[PDB]
């Protein structure tokens, strides 16, 4: 179990750690988060009390270094940093734990939620979507745009998700226009899975990361990406059976975890009704269809 | 964007454009089987592709053999239309290819767009106008090259005959749309207006009679009466 210490909390802020969140008052004696489970990526995220504008945060993996948070009064945000001096870090953490100035990552033992939301998400793939190679952790916020969004403006600050576009030469084989547009199996299995992602685990990892950025930061381009990746599978007549069974599990836990009051903006009515009721896989997402129908019957 | 009453003069500017109508591509007669069930028999159809500025009509005849052994024919018809339009554009010299293609039914947008991915600078547009292009197929000579076809065939016509020697393309299009609206709403009583007088004939190389300018005004007036009436006979007014 690892620790992310905070230098201080000079501004009132709601702090999130994965799916948990807590309020910290201006200048409250808060010095970080302990007992963070090893073996998973994590996200620590922030919303200032004075400016709910800009949710922002950092994706990290404590196996890749010792990381802490420090408020920057010039740029006006909580920044993640790496501490290269190992004995300095251990000494900092042990003092803060001794003075009980840290919150405990509050995982319930029966609870697999975070594992189920991040099963295929790897830090190395996050760092290729979010390019800032001098750091081991990745910054994301509500306003960052995606590569595909830029085509339709600062490249350094973009989310480099895999571009999916159903009306594109990559998606449509010359001479198979109707076939490839109505059955996207070619595009899913050959172009994306065999060609670009290499395997379905990398595909699911990007889908999961896109959902998490949509949910935690209200990142609109990430929501677009999540839905596009769902639609590409559902619109394929030919999908490996293990992929469909895993997709159903993935989506089920995403829908389970979604705030009930954010479903109006985070869920695209057209994609979901198509996927669950019109698509080739309309009968292949039993768990997802049952939770959607019992929790968001309005959308449908 | 969508083509409507507001931007109607754009049809007659000097940017090449084509209307594409797919109504008459997949055509059937519905009949009873010996067992008393219902079946369809397809008949020949056509794609109606019209340059509104010149009157250049590319009439691609769709022979019933193209449906043999195929499923979901109404859906296939839209993709077949898009494939043929795409093939037509690729056959034209660059300086004759359209800058816009306007489809008369919105269901043609995605099929044409996918077939034209190679042509990103050709705009595919819908329209809000209720254009009466199915109604060409009621002109006997048109009913006949389509029905007589024994194989796929492209037939080239000017749908305005020689009108552009005397009127503008705006006026020619308006005449065409009035005749076709007329030939829709009531084929029989609108068939009388054009040839119930035996001294006005069509040249061998034309679709409409050689009306003089004054006879066209009379004819056009008779067609508007027909359309207004039928709109009464229909709605009782
Ligand atoms: C064989 N004929 C004379 C023929 O096509 O009759 C029509 C019918 C309707 C409109 C026109 N223009 C001509
Ligand atoms: C390229 N096409 C549309 C074409 O030339 O159409 C015409 C025009 C005028 C007379 C004839 N016979 C055909």
């Amino acid at each position: 179990m690892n620790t992310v210490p905070f230098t201080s909390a000079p501004i009132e802020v709601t702090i999130g750690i994965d799916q948990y969140s807590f309020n910290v008052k201006e200048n409250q004696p808060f010095h970080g988060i302990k007992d963070i489970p090893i073996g998973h990526v994590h996200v620590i995220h922030f919303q200032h009390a004075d400016n709910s504008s800009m949710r922002y945060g950092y994706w990290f993996d404590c196996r890749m270094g010792n990381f802490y948070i420090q408020y920057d009064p010039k740029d006006g945000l909580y920044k993640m940093m790496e501490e290269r001096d190992g004995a300095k870090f251990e000494n900092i953490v042990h003092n803060f734990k001794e003075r009980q100035m840290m919150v405990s990552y509050p995982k319930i033992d029966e609870d697999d939620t975070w594992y189920n939301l991040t099963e295929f998400v790897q830090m190395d793939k996050i760092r290729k979507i979010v390019r800032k190679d001098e750091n081991q952790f990745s910054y994301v916020d509500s306003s960052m745009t995606t590569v595909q969004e830029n085509e339709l403006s600062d490249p350094a600050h973009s989310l480099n998700y895999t571009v999916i576009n159903f009306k594109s030469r990559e998606a449509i084989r010359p001479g198979h226009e109707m076939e490839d547009f109505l059955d996207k199996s070619y595009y899913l299995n050959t172009v994306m899975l065999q060609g670009i992602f290499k395997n379905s685990s990398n595909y699911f990892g990007e889908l999961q990361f896109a959902f998490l950025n949509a949910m935690f930061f209200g990142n609109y381009g990430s929501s677009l990406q999540w839905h596009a990746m769902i639609e590409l599978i559902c619109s394929s007549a030919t999908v490996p059976k293990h992929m469909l069974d895993k997709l159903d599990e993935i989506l089920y836990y995403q829908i389970k975890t979604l705030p009930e009051q954010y479903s109006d903006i985070l869920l695209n009515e057209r994609v979901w009704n198509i996927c669950l009721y019109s698509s080739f896989q309309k009968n292949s997402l039993h768990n997802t269809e049952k939770i959607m129908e019992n929790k968001y019957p309005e959308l449908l | 964007g969508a083509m409507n009453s507001s931007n109607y003069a754009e049809l007659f500017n000097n940017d090449i454009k084509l209307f594409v109508d797919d109504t008459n591509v997949y055509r059937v007669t519905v009949h009873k089987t010996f067992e008393g069930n219902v079946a369809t028999k397809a008949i020949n159809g056509c794609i109606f592709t019209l340059n509104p500025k010149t009157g250049h009509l590319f009439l691609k005849i769709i022979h019933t053999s193209v449906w043999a052994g195929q499923k979901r024919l109404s859906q296939l018809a839209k993709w077949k239309t898009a494939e043929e339009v795409s093939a037509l554009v690729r056959s034209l010299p660059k300086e004759e290819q359209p800058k816009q293609i306007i489809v008369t039914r919105k269901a043609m947008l995605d099929p044409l767009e996918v077939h034209m991915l190679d042509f990103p600078n050709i705009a595919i547009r819908p329209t809000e106008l209720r254009l009466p292009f199915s109604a060409a197929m009621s002109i006997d000579k048109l009913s006949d090259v389509v029905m007589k076809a024994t194989e796929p065939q492209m037939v080239l016509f000017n749908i305005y005959d020689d009108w552009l020697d005397r009127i503008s393309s705006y006026t020619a299009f308006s005449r065409l749309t009035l005749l076709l609206r007329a030939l829709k709403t009531n084929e029989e009583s609108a068939k009388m207006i054009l040839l119930s007088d035996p001294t006005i004939t069509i040249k061998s190389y034309h679709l409409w009679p050689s009306f003089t300018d004054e006879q066209w005004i009379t004819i056009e007036s008779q067609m508007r009466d027909l359309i207004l009436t039928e709109y009464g006979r229909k709605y009782n007014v």
Side-chain angles (χ1 to χ4, degrees), chain B residues 56-58 156-158:
Chain B
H56 271 203
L57 177 54
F58 301 81
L156 305 188
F157 299 112
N158 184 327

Side-chain angles (χ1 to χ4, degrees), chain B residues 138-142 144 183 190-191 194-195 202 207-209:
Chain B
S138 39
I139 289 157
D140 320 332
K141 304 199 201 154
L142 299 178
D144 300 11
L183 273 135
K191 220 139 211 217
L194 292 168
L195 10 145
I202 310 194
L207 281 170
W208 314 96

Side-chain angles (χ1 to χ4, degrees), chain A residues 154-266:
Chain A
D154 181 19
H157 210 57
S158 287
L159 292 166
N160 300 275
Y161 294 123
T162 293
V163 177
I164 301 180
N165 175 4
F166 296 142
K167 294 192 281 184
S168 76
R169 176 51 68 217
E170 295 73 5
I172 302 292
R173 282 175 301 181
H176 304 251
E177 286 83 2
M178 180 188 196
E179 175 186 17
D180 283 351
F181 186 73
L182 293 176
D183 173 10
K184 319 213 178 266
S185 300
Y186 154 72
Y187 192 32
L188 171 63
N189 291 299
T190 298
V191 174
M192 290 279 168
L193 284 177
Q194 173 175 293
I196 296 186
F197 288 96
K198 306 306 176 185
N199 54 62
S200 53
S201 294
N202 292 331
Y203 191 96
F204 288 143
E206 187 172 323
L207 182 157
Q208 286 185 314
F209 184 56
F211 170 77
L212 289 166
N213 287 326
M215 177 172 64
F216 287 125
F217 306 113
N219 190 265
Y220 177 78
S222 298
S223 180
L224 286 176
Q225 185 63 18
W226 178 55
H227 285 93
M229 297 187 81
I230 296 168
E231 184 165 7
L232 174 54
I233 290 171
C234 292
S235 299
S236 291
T238 307
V239 183
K241 312 85 166 50
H242 72 279
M243 258 189 81
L244 296 165
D245 290 334
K246 188 65 72 160
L247 181 62
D248 190 31
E249 288 304 313
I250 284 163
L251 300 178
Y252 169 85
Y253 285 104
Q254 291 170 337
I255 300 302
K256 189 175 163 65
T257 304
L258 263 188
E260 302 68 51
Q261 300 293 282
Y262 285 46
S263 43
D264 37 300
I265 50 183
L266 287 174

Side-chain angles (χ1 to χ4, degrees), chain B residues 18-22 47-49 58 60 78-92 98 101-103 108 112 115-116 119 122 124 154:
Chain B
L18 300 172
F19 281 112
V20 175
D21 180 70
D22 70 313
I47 309 163
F48 180 97
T49 297
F58 301 81
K60 180 58 191 245
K78 295 170 202 317
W79 292 89
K80 178 52 166 181
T81 297
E83 187 191 5
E84 291 294 345
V85 170
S86 167
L88 168 66
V89 170
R90 297 165 201 277
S91 79
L92 294 166
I101 304 176
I102 308 161
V103 297
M108 281 299 310
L112 197 51
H115 269 282
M116 303 287 289
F119 292 94
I122 299 180
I124 308 305
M154 163 86 91

